[PDB]
Design an enzyme around this catalytic site. Structure first.
Site, PDB file in Angstrom:
ATOM      1  N   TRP A   1     -64.158 -45.815  15.349  1.00  0.00           N
ATOM      2  CA  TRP A   1     -63.573 -46.707  14.346  1.00  0.00           C
ATOM      3  C   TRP A   1     -64.156 -48.119  14.453  1.00  0.00           C
ATOM      4  CZ3 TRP A   1     -60.812 -43.840  11.070  1.00  0.00           C
ATOM      5  CH2 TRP A   1     -60.162 -42.701  11.552  1.00  0.00           C
TER       6      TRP A   1
ATOM      7  N   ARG B   1     -52.262 -47.124  13.650  1.00  0.00           N
ATOM      8  CA  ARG B   1     -51.427 -46.663  14.752  1.00  0.00           C
ATOM      9  C   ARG B   1     -49.976 -47.133  14.675  1.00  0.00           C
ATOM     10  NH1 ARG B   1     -53.375 -43.995  18.733  1.00  0.00           N
ATOM     11  NH2 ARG B   1     -55.586 -43.359  18.585  1.00  0.00           N
TER      12      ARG B   1
ATOM     13  N   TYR C   1     -48.625 -55.408  13.931  1.00  0.00           N
ATOM     14  CA  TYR C   1     -49.848 -54.636  13.752  1.00  0.00           C
ATOM     15  C   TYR C   1     -50.679 -55.339  12.680  1.00  0.00           C
ATOM     16  CZ  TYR C   1     -52.824 -50.470  13.786  1.00  0.00           C
ATOM     17  OH  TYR C   1     -53.856 -49.593  13.898  1.00  0.00           O
TER      18      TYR C   1
HETATM   19  N1  LIG Z   1     -53.256 -45.631  22.199  1.00  0.00           N
HETATM   20  C1  LIG Z   1     -52.896 -46.977  21.791  1.00  0.00           C
HETATM   21  C2  LIG Z   1     -54.141 -47.644  21.202  1.00  0.00           C
HETATM   22  C3  LIG Z   1     -53.926 -49.097  20.785  1.00  0.00           C
HETATM   23  C4  LIG Z   1     -55.217 -49.690  20.251  1.00  0.00           C
HETATM   24  O1  LIG Z   1     -56.294 -49.369  20.745  1.00  0.00           O
HETATM   25  N2  LIG Z   1     -55.100 -50.585  19.269  1.00  0.00           N
HETATM   26  C5  LIG Z   1     -56.237 -51.320  18.730  1.00  0.00           C
HETATM   27  C6  LIG Z   1     -56.041 -51.541  17.239  1.00  0.00           C
HETATM   28  S1  LIG Z   1     -55.719 -49.976  16.379  1.00  0.00           S
HETATM   29  C7  LIG Z   1     -56.381 -52.654  19.402  1.00  0.00           C
HETATM   30  O2  LIG Z   1     -55.399 -53.376  19.549  1.00  0.00           O
HETATM   31  N3  LIG Z   1     -57.622 -52.972  19.817  1.00  0.00           N
HETATM   32  C8  LIG Z   1     -57.956 -54.191  20.528  1.00  0.00           C
HETATM   33  C9  LIG Z   1     -58.607 -55.215  19.644  1.00  0.00           C
HETATM   34  O3  LIG Z   1     -58.497 -55.083  18.406  1.00  0.00           O
HETATM   35  O4  LIG Z   1     -59.213 -56.168  20.196  1.00  0.00           O
HETATM   36  C10 LIG Z   1     -51.744 -46.960  20.809  1.00  0.00           C
HETATM   37  O5  LIG Z   1     -51.616 -45.952  20.086  1.00  0.00           O
HETATM   38  O6  LIG Z   1     -50.961 -47.935  20.773  1.00  0.00           O
END
Ligand SMILES: N[C@@H](CCC(=O)N[C@@H](CS)C(=O)NCC(=O)O)C(=O)O
Ligand SMILES: N[C@@H](CCC(=O)N[C@@H](CS)C(=O)NCC(=O)O)C(=O)O
Ligand SMILES: [Mg+2]
Lengths: 198, 198
Positions: A103, A13, A7
């Site tokens: 966000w 998350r 992460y």
């Molecule tokens: N519902 C999913 C959402 C995952 C998500 O949207 N993560 C974001 C970061 S918090 C992400 O990877 N976004 C794609 C990017 O940053 O390009 C979970 O809880 O794992």
């Protein structure tokens, strides 16, 4: 197995997974990437999203799916299939609300307005529903802590950054936060984790 | 058990529950309400949302929490804990996308623009990720159908209302839709369910 959680350097998350590993006293690699790492890392992910958890070389994704996996056959799950459903439902209710927030919005003035509208006009209804659901009970579900309690504390921590008075009418929801934060393994993680805004 | 499902007269977020009941051959009250008699019912629901499922007098909420509860210890769940996590994760990936759409947005301009942006830019990425995830396998997870495949068929049915060319580059994803639709219990439910747009 060997566990590697990937992460950003944020609670976000991933944090629910981090609390579960702490509570269960399970070692894992807490891999925190920088934005600069993201494109290279994203290219390997199944749905282009983090967190992911690698488990003996196989990739899991979706924070709450992973949380549920880690809590299966533990005291965090809920004691019955019915209570496990309530745990899931509370978590998804919280998550649904967190997902309303823009966000990723780049226009800071628009982002701020939307945050303030959600926290002023929408949040109080959820807070009242949660308070009424908890009633006079010690924990949200059953007679002992579950990962729904953890998720409440995690989500409310972030909401409080933007709306400090969120829980001023809901002392029972503050007591629940404090009870989670007092669990020794959780207290230890909270004390030692990297300090990040989100 | 005695099951009463309450939702709008719409496939929407209740349809996954309806497929599971059909596949498992479980009898239930398919209670379909209207927006007229909503506020009467809303005030009594735990978090003010539908669907809810009443099980032997006890109320459950959250569509996917309910779906999971109904599929536990059935052939639809996934064959190992890791595989159950994969099922959950696919379901949340699909749900996350469907929930990005501003379904109840009254500001016509932003609704039209958001729908168009999600369908033009985001949807093709998700389709490519899903096709790659499926590869040449018969079902999304493991060697047999899971409720993740049901949710694919349900979500894609709705997406195709708004973007008919969604799966032009993805024959294997269409094949999966048809395999789900050919399961006799599902086929029968599709034939007899109320014809709604959504
Ligand atoms: N519902 C999913 C959402 C995952 C998500 O949207 N993560 C974001 C970061 S918090 C992400 O990877 N976004 C794609 C990017 O940053 O390009 C979970 O809880 O794992
Ligand atoms: N993630 C929840 C979403 C529940 C939800 O938002 N349902 C909508 C209808 S699709 C609702 O009840 N809206 C509140 C209202 O209409 O006042 C679930 O899947 O059950
Ligand atoms: Mg969700």
């Amino acid at each position: 197995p060997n566990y590697k959680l990937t992460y950003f350097n944020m609670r976000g998350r991933a944090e629910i997974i981090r609390y579960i590993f702490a509570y269960l006293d399970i070692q894992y690699e807490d891999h925190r990437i920088e934005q600069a790492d993201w494109p290279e890392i994203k290219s390997t992910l199944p749905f282009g999203k983090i967190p992911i958890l690698e488990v003996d070389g196989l990739t899991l994704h979706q924070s709450l799916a992973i949380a549920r996996y880690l809590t299966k056959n533990t005291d965090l799950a809920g004691n019955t299939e019915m209570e496990q459903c309530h745990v899931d439902a509370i978590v998804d209710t919280l998550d649904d609300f967190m997902s309303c927030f823009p966000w990723a919005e780049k226009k800071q003035d628009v982002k701020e307005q939307m945050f303030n509208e959600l926290l002023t006009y929408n949040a109080p209804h959820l807070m009242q529903d949660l308070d009424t659901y908890l009633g006079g009970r010690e924990w949200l579900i059953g007679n002992s802590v579950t990962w729904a309690d953890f998720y409440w504390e995690i989500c409310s921590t972030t909401l409080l950054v933007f709306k400090p008075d969120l829980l001023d009418n809901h002392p029972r929801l503050v007591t629940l936060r404090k009870k989670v934060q007092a669990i020794p393994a959780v207290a230890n993680w909270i004390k030692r984790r990297p300090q990040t805004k989100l």
